[PDB]
């Protein structure tokens, strides 16, 4: 589990963050499903929802990598008409994606997303 490179989940310091910088934030229906509480956490912490990370410091990218603990009230509907309640605590995108691996019912993406942007090799 060495993979290609870290930081690959959000390696963009200049994109429009409201346009789905992170891949789970841009899905067909899960896009808003995660953008809801991720924008909530962005408002709570204090980093903007759409401003590129170069007008802002790189601390915005670092603090979306590490995130923060605790959960907030959040619920929204997708384009497909369903209603999923992703109520869990995630420590930034590094542990949010790990939560996706350890929680989601999609047995394919739960290992597809780990390879490109998660590096947890064998320590022993």
């Amino acid at each position: 589990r060495k993979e290609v490179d870290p930081e690959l989940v959000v390696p963009d310091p200049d994109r429009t963050l409201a346009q789905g910088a992170v891949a789970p934030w841009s899905n067909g229906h899960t896009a808003e499903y995660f953008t809801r509480m991720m924008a909530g956490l962005g408002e709570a912490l204090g980093f903007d929802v759409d401003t590129p990370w170069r007008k802002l410091p790189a601390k915005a990218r670092k603090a979306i990598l590490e995130g923060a603990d605790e959960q907030v009230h959040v619920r929204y509907r997708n384009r497909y008409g369903r209603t999923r309640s992703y109520y869990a605590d995630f420590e930034g995108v590094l542990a949010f994606l790990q939560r996706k691996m350890s929680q989601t019912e999609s047995e394919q993406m739960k290992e597809r997303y780990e390879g490109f942007m998660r590096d947890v090799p064998c320590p022993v």
């Binding site: 963009d12 310091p13 994109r15 891949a23 899905n27 590129p52 993406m109 942007m117």
Partner: protein, 342 residues
């Protein structure tokens, strides 16, 4: 066809306007410090046949496909790919949709057909169930497929020919379902009939007309609708879809990322494809294509070369502009190739 390329009368420079580029209505990418890149600024024009070229593995694919196509796919149509190591894409207010067509050699399973994955076979079943006889006999579009147990006889076991099925007699449809003679023909009759002579068919009904017309615009209407993938040569699996994957919203600046037609189709087939591209680009479409040949991208109006040397010796833009402009520059080998033959 290979001889027709050299003695072309069609693989010529074909001078376009080349001024449909815009100083402001234009996309930029900067700072892409990928393992295959360095962080250069690529200036993609809009409303043009811009072609990204350079040595493969020098970062052109990681920028155009892994970075650009990924981001506009995931938040401009609803895809899922990771953006990758980059910083910026501009013209967000000037972009509406994106369609990506890969090389995708995928034709190996008999289940996949040029009409089943394209999403047109279900509509064909719906249209056939819209007939009076299919209504009285209680046959539904789902019942009228060949993969579900309802419509496939156990004698064929689903393959049509085993010596064919005794009951079906080489038609791949049980007698209880073949009675549906809509427009004097059945599904087996339509599948057997060639698309070239079926161009007059499905003309009124819109979606099948569009699919068939764009397939004929490609010029390869020899295939049948239910043709098994083992009999389809690798390379043309996504060409049929790519025909219809080049005009959305009729703006038509909606960007289409193209694979290499050189893989598979030879340069005369690629020049017919080029005629299609030029016609609908004059209509207003936009294509970003990674290519390997010379005259096909010489016909285009804008060339961007990313990396002169393979491996670590690339990752930076060395030219951007008219094919003759990059030709005059003795740095990009793409331009050098476009310069030795004018």
């Amino acid at each position: 066809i290979t001889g027709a390329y050299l003695s072309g009368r069609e693989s010529i420079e074909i001078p376009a306007i080349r001024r449909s580029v815009d100083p402001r209505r234009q996309l930029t990418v900067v700072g892409a410090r990928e393992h295959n890149l360095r962080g250069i600024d690529v200036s993609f024009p809009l409303g043009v046949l811009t072609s990204v070229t350079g040595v493969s593995g020098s970062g052109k694919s990681t920028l155009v496909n892994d970075i650009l196509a990924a981001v506009l796919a995931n938040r401009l149509n609803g895809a899922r790919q990771v953006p990758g190591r980059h910083t910026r894409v501009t013209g967000l207010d000037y972009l509406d949709k994106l369609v990506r067509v890969d090389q995708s050699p995928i034709g190996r399973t008999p289940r996949s057909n040029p009409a089943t994955y394209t999403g047109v076979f279900d509509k064909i079943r719906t249209l056939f169930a819209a007939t009076t006889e299919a209504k009285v006999r209680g046959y539904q579009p789902g019942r009228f497929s060949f993969n579900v147990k309802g419509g496939r006889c156990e004698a064929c076991t689903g393959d049509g020919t085993i010596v064919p099925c005794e009951v079906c007699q080489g038609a791949r449809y049980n007698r209880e379902t073949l009675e549906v003679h809509y427009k004097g023909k059945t599904v087996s009759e339509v599948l057997d009939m060639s698309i070239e002579e079926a161009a007059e068919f499905f003309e009124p009904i819109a979606g099948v007309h569009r699919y068939l017309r764009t397939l004929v615009d490609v010029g390869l209407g020899y295939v049948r609708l239910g043709q098994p993938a083992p009999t389809l040569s690798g390379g043309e699996a996504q060409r049929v879809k790519l025909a219809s994957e080049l005009q959305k919203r009729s703006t038509g600046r909606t960007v289409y990322i193209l694979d290499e037609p050189t893989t598979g189709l030879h340069f005369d087939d690629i020049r017919k494809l080029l005629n299609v591209i030029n016609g609908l680009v004059d209509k207003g479409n936009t294509v970003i294509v990674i290519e390997h040949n010379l005259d096909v991208i010489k016909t285009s109006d804008w060339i961007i070369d990313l990396g002169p040397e393979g491996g670590a010796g690339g990752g930076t833009v060395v030219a951007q502009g008219t094919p003759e402009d990059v030709a005059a520059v003795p740095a990009s080998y793409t331009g050098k190739f476009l310069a030795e033959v004018v």
